[PDB]
Structures are given as structure tokens and as C-alpha cells.
Design a protein around this ligand. Structure first.
Ligand SMILES: C#CCN(C)Cc1nc([C@]2(O)CN[C@@H](c3nc(-c4ccc(C(F)(F)F)cc4N)no3)C2)cs1
Length: 330
């Protein structure tokens, strides 16, 4: 089998991408944030505290003839930004772009933190990291991809995120029309449950390439590109007036600037992020200070190839017996 679904930016900055997901019978379509950096499929639901729902579409398991309570199962998750959610668990039929998993664990939120409430466009998350990170207790659950993998034509999914435009998540096949040149595959460590790999270095703008190993994760659920402070400083040093602001929480730059590109290495290949992809716009409405799309990972403990990096590429998440990641230009 295969599936293919369009993913759409939630706003003009590409802060996140939402993909329609069919849950239950008859289908209840919710727009979920596909997150290769986590492993829970959770949704706003008829069980979510009413004051914490503000415009999201909710999953109502009592209206699904295929929903079954996963008795005694609870979940609770906290994300890198400090947001969180928790609740109980149903199993139900879940379909993405024509690909159907029966008995998928659908984690129904009883509580969500303020940042989720405040984002009326995100109805929940669909985790695509390794199932070892799934938070369901006492019986850990598998991700949608893990459940679908054996049925797929090929045990892969691909992320083709758009820049200020929709893109595509495909399951079970590689669309050879969706990229230029070749896909360079690189080794993955699953030891932390992430799609963790080592970039071979970087370049800023038209500068020469600096060979240096950068261990990080391919994370569609993170907006920005988080890299070591040395690399990030070398980038922003090329932008007049750019500086790290403790009050804002990262590097800012004058909105009047044109930004240089940023290249990252995948083996001997190179992915070039155009400068415009690094511009996240005014820090507040009407400000002439703009937020940078490349930020330091120093406080995180891991480098994160988030959407800023991934949307410059066609990315293969290869879930073969030995997982690998593939990157192609597009
Ligand atoms: C600190 C620290 C060390 N490590 C935990 C950092 C890491 N962190 C992660 C993710 O937790 C997993 N992938 C990312 C993700 N973020 C979201 C997300 C989406 C929407 C909203 C909002 F605004 F609507 F509330 C909040 C989110 N947090 N979805 O995925 C972040 C992987 S490594």
C-alpha cells in the first residue's frame, strides 16, 4: 500500500504544517502536525477540558463505531518548547492520504497547555519518530508509520515541505519526480528514539565549505534550524546588525537585510537553504527587528534540523531494518 497527503503551512511564516488525517468511522478529519521528533498521535477531543479548546476540530470517540477505549492507558508528553498535553487512549481506524491503519492508538487529550489552545489550526500531533519514545502507559503504543510499515510497498515515508506553500507527505514510495539530482542516504542512530544523523559540515552564502560533524535530528515538528553556537555565530556574523537578543530569545536581524544562504552537508552532497527561508519576520507586528531561522542549540542538548532545513530538501525517512535518512535537492 501507499498513502499521499498534502501538508499546508498554518501561517505566512511556515511556523508549522498541518496534514488532514481521517480518524474513526464515519471519518472525522482532523488537521494534525506530523512530527518526526515525537512518537505520539494525540488529538483534541470531546474529552479535552472545554476552556482549553479554542477553535480546534475535536475527535469524538463516542461517534466512531470503530473506536475502542484502550482500558487503563494514559499518556502525557512535554515538548521542547515547554508545551504539554495528556489524556487517555482509544484505538481506532486512522487514514492518511489513502493509507489506512486499523487499531491505531489515538491519544485523546484531556488537558493541553496554553500554546496548543492558542493555535486553533492544529488539531493534534501525529508522531513519526521511533515508537520507543511513545508515552502511552502501561502499554507503549506504536506510531502510525510503525503500524503501517509492513503493509507499505516500501518501508519509508517522505517529507517534501513547501516554502510558504503546501507540500507532501508520502508513505510507502519515493516520488522520483519530486526532487532533482540524486538522494544521498546517510546513517541514522535510533539510540535516542529520533531520526538522528550526522551532517558533514556547512557553508554560509558563497563561502567555502567547513567540514565538521554535526550530530542532530531531522524534525518536521520543529520550525527552525538549531545548530551549535559556533556555526550560528559564523552565519549571523555575515548579516549587518544581527545579534543574539536574550530578551527576544535568539538571533534577530534588521528586517531591511537580505540574508545569505546556508548550506549543510549530507555525506558528500549539499543542501542549500536560500536566505529567504531564514527570515521569520518581525519579532512583533510592525517591528523592524526580524527573527532568525537559524538559532543556537546550546541550551537544547541536541542539534535540530527543523523545517527551515527540511523544506529545502526532499527527505526520505527510511524505516528499513537499518533505518537511514535520504536528502535530495529540489
Ligand atoms: C528542550 C529540549 C531538548 N529536547 C526535548 C528538544 C526536542 N524537542 C523535540 C520536540 O518536542 C519534538 N518535535 C518538536 C515539536 N514541536 C511541536 C509543537 C507544535 C505545536 C506547538 C504549539 F505551539 F501549537 F503549542 C508546540 C509544539 N511543541 N510539535 O513537534 C519538538 C524533539 S527534540
Amino acid at each position: 500500500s501507499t498513502g499521499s497527503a498534502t501538508t499546508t503551512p498554518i501561517d505566512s511564516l511556515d511556523d508549522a504544517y498541518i496534514t488532514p488525517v481521517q480518524i474513526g468511522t464515519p471519518a472525522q478529519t482532523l488537521n494534525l502536525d506530523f512530527d518526526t521528533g515525537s512518537s505520539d498521535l494525540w488529538v483534541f477531543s470531546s474529552e479535552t477540558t472545554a476552556s482549553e479548546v479554542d477553535g480546534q476540530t475535536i475527535y469524538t470517540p463516542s461517534k466512531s463505531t470503530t473506536a475502542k477505549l484502550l482500558s487503563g492507558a494514559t499518556w502525557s508528553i512535554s515538548y521542547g518548547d515547554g508545551s504539554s498535553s495528556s489524556g487517555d487512549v482509544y484505538t481506532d481506524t486512522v487514514s492518511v492520504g489513502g493509507l489506512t491503519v486499523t487499531g491505531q492508538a489515538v491519544e485523546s487529550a484531556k488537558k493541553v497547555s496554553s500554546s496548543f489552545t492558542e493555535d486553533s489550526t492544529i488539531d493534534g500531533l501525529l508522531g513519526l519518530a521511533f515508537s520507543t519514545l511513545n508515552t502511552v502507559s502501561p502499554t507503549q503504543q506504536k506510531t502510525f508509520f510503525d503500524n503501517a510499515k509492513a503493509s507499505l510497498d516500501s518501508p519509508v515515508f517522505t517529507a517534501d515541505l513547501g516554502y510558504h506553500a503546501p507540500g507532501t507527505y508520502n508513505f510507502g514510495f519515493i516520488d522520483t519526480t519530486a526532487y532533482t539530482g540524486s538522494i544521498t542516504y546517510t546513517a541514522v542512530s535510533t539510540k535516542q528514539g529520533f531520526w538522528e544523523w550526522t551532517s558533514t559540515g556547512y557553508a554560509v552564502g558563497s563561502g567555502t565549505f567547513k567540514s565538521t560533524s554535526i550530530d542532530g535530528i531531522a524534525d518536521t515538528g520543529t520550525t527552525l534550524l538549531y545548530l551549535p553556537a559556533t556555526v550560528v555565530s559564523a552565519y549571523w556574523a555575515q548579516v549587518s546588525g544581527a545579534k543574539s537578543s536574550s530578551s527576544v530569545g535568539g538571533y534577530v536581524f534588521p528586517c531591511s537585510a537580505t540574508l545569505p544562504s546556508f548550506t549543510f552537508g549530507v555525506g558528500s552532497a549539499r543542501i542549500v537553504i536560500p536566505g529567504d527561508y531564514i527570515d521569520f519576520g518581525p519579532i512583533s507586528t510592525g517591528s523592524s527587528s526580524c527573527f532568525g531561522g537559524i538559532q543556537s542549540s546550546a541550551g537544547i542538548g541536541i542539534n535540530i534540523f527543523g523545517d527551515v532545513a527540511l523544506k529545502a530538501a526532499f527527505v526520505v525517512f527510511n524505516g528499513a531494518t537499518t533505518p537511514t535518512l535520504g536528502f535530495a535537492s529540489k
